[PDB]
Amino acid sequence: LPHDRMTSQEAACFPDIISGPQQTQKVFLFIRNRTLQLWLDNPKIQLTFEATLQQLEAPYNSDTVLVHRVHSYLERHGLINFGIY
Amino acid sequence: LPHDRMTSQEAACFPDIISGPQQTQKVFLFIRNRTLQLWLDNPKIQLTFEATLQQLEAPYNSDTVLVHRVHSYLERHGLINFGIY
Prior knowledge:
Two copies of one chain form a homodimer.
Chain A: H1 8-13, H2 15-18, H3 22-41, H4 49-54, H5 64-76
Helix pairs in contact in A: 3-5
């Protein structure tokens, strides 16, 4: 996926962000990008929401609702935690 | 000034930010707070816009228009660069 652009699938789950200011799109992208990096560095164990929040730096760790949405989107779509129950 | 709240004077110059989402208010506050810290650690030399941008970390250094507005507001109101021509 491109690091610097939201996809069609993301638009469906984040219409508030894709329709909104560029700044907030960049926050979304940072959270998505970092979450995927954390998963791909260790893809044999479950990457949890709580663990993702603890491994994100300020200010990305401050909108906990946004981080939970990104995590949930990634897990439900299979981009993280594939094959982990 | 409070680190975690915008003032009446700031509201007059940043009506778009004070009326908008909490996330973006927190970005404004971080830029304002850090700019003041940089000035107060060395209050005998001019703190320029360019120098402020170079001493800010990502992602605060990415909305260069917002950083210039905060710098200009602080200098015109006398909170930084007092007595420097």
